RNA sequence: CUUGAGUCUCGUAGAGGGGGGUAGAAUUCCAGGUGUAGCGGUGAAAUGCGUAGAGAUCUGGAGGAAUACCGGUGGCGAAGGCGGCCCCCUGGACGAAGACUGACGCUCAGGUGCGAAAGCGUGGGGAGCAAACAGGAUUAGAUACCCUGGUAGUCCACGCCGUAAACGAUGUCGACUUGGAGGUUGUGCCCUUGAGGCGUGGCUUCCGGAGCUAACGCGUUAAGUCGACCGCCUGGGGAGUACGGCCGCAAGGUUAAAACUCAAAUGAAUUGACGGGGGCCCGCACAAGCGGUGGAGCAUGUGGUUUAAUUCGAUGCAACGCGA
């Protein structure tokens, strides 16, 4: 067997527990947009590869056609409701 | 009929249908139920499901007699011997 | 004469046989209650049971069959074959020393006897089963298969049959020729503990040497090496048939051809083919995740419609944004 891919820690905070999250809410290779999505939701709110990955995917996967101003900020509400 | 909470369960475990009686220690039957004819008949009989449902039928046929411990003296081997035994024991009885 | 053969003396093991009773497990109905919607089964129902009390329970009976464990790589028997317990009668085998006889032997055509199962005949017996036969459905139709009953038979006595893949597909008797691994049953020496350690017989299972064999294999229980006598074979089919004889209660058996036809039939082994009795391993093949196509409008391609033509080829994966 082989281990899971090792990703460099999120440069902005130098922490590994945030890069994996921003890579899956990402769409179509648009990482640059991803920070515009989640950092606005994060910087302004103020085996380990099975259950954390699956549960956190469920959070991202319900923001496609909810029909409001912008799901960019709706997911901020969703995580605010979650938190 | 006697409310003794005792007796034996003569399991007439035949291949096609296992038709268990509830007789006392003396040797007189209390209440009866059957697997075949009692909700299903065919060549698809002789299954552990049939033995289990026969066990629950034989239980509910004598659940009103005030009996809570019935021994098992099985006559011959039948399909789903463990299924009927487990189903009968699940009814709250002592062998 | 005594080495073969036998007689004797003493023990051992054995489903060897014939009888005689003997007991339970299971077996069905009745004798009763306990019980009322079931019992029953296949490809599927159904046929047959039952609510008139049906199954099971315990209770006693009835009666027949057969003796689960032991149980076996076991045993005994000429073979067929023999399996609960116990008695009576009985047969054979083997071992230890000794005595006795004194070649009394081996094999045997003919002959005689025994001889599974089925069957037959005569009387019984019949608990289960089970050719036949009887219900249902079959299946392409069903007189399939099946299930439900079921009679002969199966069991006993006597008589007949006299046949089997009656097979180790290996006649009987004797002698000789390396080993290894067992089992069963005696017995000698020494452990005088029970086995024991070492012999030594008989039976028996399996490897394998030489040898033999076409090969497979056999291999001291030979299919080796020999000797005695017997039986048998002579291409396949016709055919173990016809005819005759003998035998049998018909039932059939035994002995046993020919015409005709074919150029094979056959044994053993080799390769590799279905081989619907297997495993193992690997792979975005599955598991996880990601993104999608099948909905629509156009682009192109493919089949189909018409037209003179809609040029031809490509047309599962390995044609269809292909030749172009």
Tokens at residue A63, please?
Answer: 């923001």
CB B11 within 8 A of CB B84: yes
**Nucleotide closest to residue B21 (CA–C1'):** C56
- Protein-to-nucleotide distance from the CA of B17 to the C1' of C134, whole angstroms: 28
Nearest to B84 by CA among B62, B60, B61, B58: B58
Which ranges constitute the DSSP H helices of A1-83? 19-24, 31-42, 51-60, 71-82
> Which nucleotides in chain C have some atom under 7 angstroms from a protein Cβ?
32-46, 54-59, 288-291
Q: How many CA atoms lie within 13 A of B55 on its CB side?
A: 26
Alpha-carbon distances of B65 from A43, A72, B8, B70, rounded to whole Å: 72, 69, 13, 12
Nucleotide nearest to B40 (CA to C1'): C38
Q: Nearest nt (C1') to A49 (CA)? A: C288
Report yes or no: B13 and B78 within 8 Å, Cβ to Cβ.
yes
Please give the Cα distance from A53 to A69 (Å, whole number).
28
Q: DSSP assignment, residue A9?
A: -
């Amino acid at each position: 067997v082989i281990g899971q891919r090792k990703i460099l820690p999120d440069p902005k905070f130098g922490s590994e527990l945030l890069a994996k999250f921003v890579n899956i809410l990402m769409v179509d290779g648009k990482k640059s947009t991803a920070e515009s999505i989640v950092y606005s939701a994060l910087e302004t709110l103020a085996r380990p590869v099975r259950r954390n990955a699956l549960a956190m995917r469920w959070i991202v996967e319900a923001a496609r056609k909810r029909g409001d101003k912008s799901m960019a900020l709706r997911l901020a509400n969703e995580l605010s409701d979650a938190a | 009929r006697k409310q003794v909470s005792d007796g034996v369960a003569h399991i007439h475990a035949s291949f096609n249908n296992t038709i268990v009686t509830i007789t006392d220690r003396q040797g007189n039957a209390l209440g009866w139920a059957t697997a075949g004819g009692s909700g299903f008949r065919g060549s698809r009989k002789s299954t552990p499901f049939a033995a289990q449902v026969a066990a629950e039928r034989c239980a509910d046929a004598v659940k009103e007699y005030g009996i809570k411990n019935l021994e098992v003296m099985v006559k011959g081997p039948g399909p789903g011997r463990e299924s009927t035994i487990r189903a009968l024991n699940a009814a709250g009885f002592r062998i």
